[PDB]
Ligand binder design. Structure first.
Ligand SMILES: [Zn+2]
Lengths: 142, 340
């Protein structure tokens, strides 16, 4: 729907993706009830990297409808979710550099420099690779 | 009519000093004179109390006395309350004299000997003073017993027994000031608000509004006082249960669209958090989700005159904040999902 350009029904499906991450758990092998995804669809890494992504995909719709407080809240959540994606910090810092840079931005700079792939599946890494912006480290050395 | 004024104001002076602790000068003469005057008031009350210009004239003198004293700054004297308090004025005075500790021994002796000779006058024509203090001590005890072995703090406060009572006292007291026309009832209600325990007070009013008429000029005064002052009405809608305010609405629809306005203002002070499946307040004093769900559930569980109003007031509020049809987004989506 974002490629067909329709903010509403995008922010629908991102929000419904975030409800079936958070009012449900995928790690319920109390009943091995069938044949089931060993590897791809149970990794804590695959879960925190679906979450960061959904909040990014939705926080940029919030920038496009012009509600940049909502956007900030979902971006701030995604850094709380997955501190080793860096796309999250880029989107959050772009929002802060627009509005209220100085102390907030620097506080996250020092965190990135404090910080410094395991088994995420393909469809998902290719999706992350897809959205990520080229001009990312360029922004992080400013 | 004119003869009664100098009698009654002199008795009122003597009543107000009954409470007061100067009692050294008093003697059997003073006591006897007091109770003779009190007999005459009780006499008047019987003779030409009913359906007279005299009654209404004494009520003007009552309320004029009771507003020029006011009950602010100098001395908050209760006084002889109203027209039926003339029928047992004697008792009030005698009770106040017992409560004065500095009441002189000889006066108290003459007093108690005159109130309670004993059973020598078990034959008395007029339902006498002795019998009045007995049937009081009885009622009193009866109350106390019934409170501690019988009394229940009803959950439909519109059917409570103390509330129902305190309510009807305030309504009498507004009816009097209404016919006096001295100061506006607004001033009286404002002085209430200032002075007394507020929490208790408000439940009173709430019950007041649903009491059927007795002579609803009172009810029509309370709606206008409240709507005049939005700040107290904010704590009204805050401080009660849902059912009480639902019935306030179905009865007096001049309140409905201001209270819907309040919720409309409190919901819009919420945010979803994705970790915990809930709206919550920033600040401590902001209605939690469950409180607001209750109150709306109530407005809905109501007559059709209100139900369509509140349903449409939400749907228009939903469209205003994006007509999404999933939660996370619009508080009002949430409510409307929750109510099916
Ligand atoms: Zn799988």
């Amino acid at each position: 729907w974002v490629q067909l350009g329709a903010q509403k029904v995008a922010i629908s499906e991102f929000s419904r993706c975030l409800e079936l991450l958070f009012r449900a758990t995928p790690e319920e092998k109390e009943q091995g009830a069938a044949f089931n995804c060993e590897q791809g669809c149970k990794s804590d890494a695959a879960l925190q990297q679906l979450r960061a992504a959904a909040l990014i995909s939705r926080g940029l719709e919030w920038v496009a409808s012009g509600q940049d407080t909502k956007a900030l809240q979902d971006f701030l959540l995604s850094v709380q979710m997955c501190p080793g994606n860096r796309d999250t910090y880029f989107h959050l810092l772009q929002t802060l550099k627009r509005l209220d840079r100085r102390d907030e931005a620097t506080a996250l700079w020092w965190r990135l420099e404090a910080q410094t792939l395991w088994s995420l599946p393909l469809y998902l890494e290719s999706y992350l690779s897809w959205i990520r912006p080229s001009d990312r480290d360029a922004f992080l050395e400013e | 009519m004119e003869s009664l004024l100098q009698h009654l104001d002199r008795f009122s002076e003597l009543l107000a000093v009954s409470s007061t602790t100067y009692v050294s000068t008093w003697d059997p003469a003073t006591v006897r004179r007091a109770l003779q005057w009190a007999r005459y008031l009780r006499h008047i009350h019987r003779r030409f109390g009913r359906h007279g210009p005299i009654r209404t004239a004494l009520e003007r003198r009552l309320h004029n006395q009771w507003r020029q004293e006011g009950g602010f700054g100098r001395g908050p004297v209760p006084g002889l309350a109203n027209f039926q308090a003339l029928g047992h004025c004697d008792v009030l005075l005698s009770l106040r004299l017992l409560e004065n500790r500095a009441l002189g021994d000889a006066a108290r002796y003459h007093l108690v000997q005159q109130l309670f000779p004993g059973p020598g006058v078990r034959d008395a024509d007029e339902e006498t003073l002795q019998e009045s203090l007995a049937r009081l001590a009885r009622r009193r005890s009866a109350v106390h017993m019934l409170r501690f072995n019988g009394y229940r703090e009803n959950p439909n406060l519109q059917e409570d027994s103390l509330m129902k009572t305190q309510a009807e006292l305030l309504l009498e007291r507004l009816q009097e000031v209404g016919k006096a026309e001295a100061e506006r009832p607004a001033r009286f209600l404002s002085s209430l608000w200032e002075r007394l325990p507020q929490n208790n007070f408000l439940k009173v009013i709430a019950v007041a509004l649903l009491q059927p008429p007795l002579s609803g000029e009172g009810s029509q005064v309370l709606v206008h006082w409240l709507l005049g002052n939005s700040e107290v009405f904010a704590a009204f809608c805050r401080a009660l249960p849902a059912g009480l305010l639902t019935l306030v609405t179905s009865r007096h629809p001049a309140l409905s669209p201001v209270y819907l306005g309040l919720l409309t203002d409190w919901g819009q002070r919420l945010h979803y958090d994705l970790q915990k499946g809930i709206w919550v307040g920033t600040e401590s004093q902001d209605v939690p989700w469950e409180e607001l769900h209750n109150r709306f559930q109530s407005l809905c569980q109501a007559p059709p005159p209100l139900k369509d109003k509140v349903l449409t007031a939400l749907e228009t509020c939903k469209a205003q904040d994006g007509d999404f049809e999933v939660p996370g987004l619009s508080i009002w989506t949430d409510l409307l999902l929750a109510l099916r």
